[PDB]
Design a binder for this molecule. Structure first.
Ligand code: NA
Length: 493
């Protein structure tokens, strides 16, 4: 019904903003990126995505491309507004073709004035998902409105060629990732105990008493920080055993550094870099880490790494025999760090996410503390998870934002120094996030019914960068620089 459409015309306007009532990670920016492989996805009738053109224009159609658009028909209305507050329906009870993944036009008359155009979804012919790979408002008196956006047999036939191309590109992308879980990369740095130091692994290391109150340039990590109570897991595998290369307390405490992934910065800070690629700690782990694991045996390798023993602590809520057997009771981990870079590649639900502190027992995590920055947010979020009742329950707690990381300017920027404290006393865990010039944020977790005090559970702290992105490019990475890493425990009486 539109005799007057043109094959070519003026370029479409760039919206100044794309927003949405809700989404699952896959946000409304993905409507305007001229990319069929990305989508805005949102579940529920009446959820919307809105384009702001920044000023009032005349429009008479929209063009839209649909996720899985050759498998089901999407149901929707289109509304417009001049003021952004009240909405006029211009297209009602629309149904996509069900036959194509490309752009399809939905056109009306007369043209209307609008600054804002929104897609209101009513799910699809199979389920409740509103999933749209492209949306733009069009004025067919000035822009291209091509016949190829009315879905006929020839358009569907051309798409078979496009889909085959896209499938081939997908297989090529997969082939490029073949070395994902491999540790074959990185220079080799010296292990002190194998080269320059005779390490007495029958004995605990000396307690380092020199340490400067703030880290100094030119010091090894062990001269700026107490490294005697950690081992480091590195995501490369130079001894070819299929596992990370671990750096024992005796090597760490004697000045170990690796110039790519664990080293003293020009300003003294301790840098941890974690690529997406790397050998992982086990089959059941999806992600690489460059991360320290607490070792209260402090280099006395006669003491086993695992167990309620003199290498691990327990909560003071644990049975008496555990309190006495453990190396200490309760615990505080306090760190100061900045985030240098967060992954910017990968799927919408993983990109920019990693973990900067943990408590673990043999199986589960009393806490995992996350930072996450999205590529299109100017700052990042910090939040945590608490697993409970043998990990059959998991609860997320915000500190500065949450796992969605939609913090705008209100989060923690790259390069911004901040501190955290994780303080366990019995079945209470207090997590504090401290920032310069701002009030502390404090979350108290009641672990009463969490099951960490039953008996037999041993604990250790972790700190560093544990990636939570596997889908990103293999060389993409997250990096943090620490200025404080202080661990404390109480003693059994
Ligand atoms: Na897209």
């Amino acid at each position: 019904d539109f005799p007057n459409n043109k094959e070519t015309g003026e370029a479409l306007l760039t919206p100044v903003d794309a927003t949405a009532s809700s989404h699952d990670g896959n946000g409304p920016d993905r409507l305007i990126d001229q990319d069929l492989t990305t989508r805005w996805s949102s579940a529920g009738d009446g959820e919307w995505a809105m384009l702001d053109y920044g000023s009032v224009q005349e429009f008479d159609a929209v063009q839209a491309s649909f996720s899985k658009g050759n498998e089901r028909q999407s149901k929707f209305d289109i509304q417009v507004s001049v003021d952004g507050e009240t909405w006029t329906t211009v297209l009602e009870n629309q149904l996509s073709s069900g036959k194509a993944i490309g752009l399809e036009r939905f056109q009306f008359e007369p043209a209307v004035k609008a600054r804002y155009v929104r897609y209101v979804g009513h799910g699809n012919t199979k389920n409740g998902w509103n999933s749209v790979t492209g949306l733009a408002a069009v004025n067919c008196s000035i822009n291209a409105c091509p016949a190829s956006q009315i879905i006929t047999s020839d358009v569907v036939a051309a798409e078979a060629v496009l889909i085959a191309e896209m499938k081939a590109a997908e297989k090529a992308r997969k082939a490029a990732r073949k070395d994902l879980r491999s540790g074959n990369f990185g220079v080799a740095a010296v292990y002190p105990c194998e080269t320059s130091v005779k390490c007495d692994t029958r004995s605990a290391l000396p307690v380092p008493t020199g340490l400067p109150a703030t880290p100094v340039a030119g010091n090894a990590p062990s001269e700026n920080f107490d490294m005697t109570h950690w081992y480091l897991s590195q995501p490369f595998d130079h001894d070819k055993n299929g596992k990370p290369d671990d750096v024992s307390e005796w090597n760490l405490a004697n000045g170990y550094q690796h110039p790519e992934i664990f080293y003293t910065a020009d300003d003294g800070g301790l840098v941890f870099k974690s690529y997406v690629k790397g050998v992982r700690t086990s089959k059941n782990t999806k992600y690489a880490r460059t991360e320290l694991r607490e070792m209260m045996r402090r280099g006395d390798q006669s003491i086993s790494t695992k167990g309620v023993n003199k290498n691990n602590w327990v909560f003071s809520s644990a049975p008496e025999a555990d309190l006495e057997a453990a190396a200490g009771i309760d615990g505080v981990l306090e760190a100061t760090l900045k985030i240098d870079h967060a992954t910017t590649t990968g799927n919408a639900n993983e990109v920019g996410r990693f973990i900067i502190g943990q408590i673990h027992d043999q199986n589960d995590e009393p806490i995992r503390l996350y930072y996450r920055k999205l590529p299109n947010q100017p700052t990042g979020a910090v939040y945590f998870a608490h697993e409970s009742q043998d990990a059959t329950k998991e609860d997320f707690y915000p500190l500065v934002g949450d796992m969605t990381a939609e913090v705008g300017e209100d989060g923690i920027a790259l390069g911004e120094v901040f501190s955290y404290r994780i303080d366990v006393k019995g079945n209470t865990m207090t997590v504090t996030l401290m920032r310069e010039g701002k009030d502390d944020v404090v979350q108290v977790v009641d672990m009463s019914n969490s099951g960490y005090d039953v008996g037999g559970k041993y604990m250790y702290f972790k700190a560093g960068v544990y990636n939570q992105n596997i889908s990103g490019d293999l060389d993409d990475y997250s990096q943090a620089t620490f200025y404080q890493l202080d661990v404390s425990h109480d003693q059994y009486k």
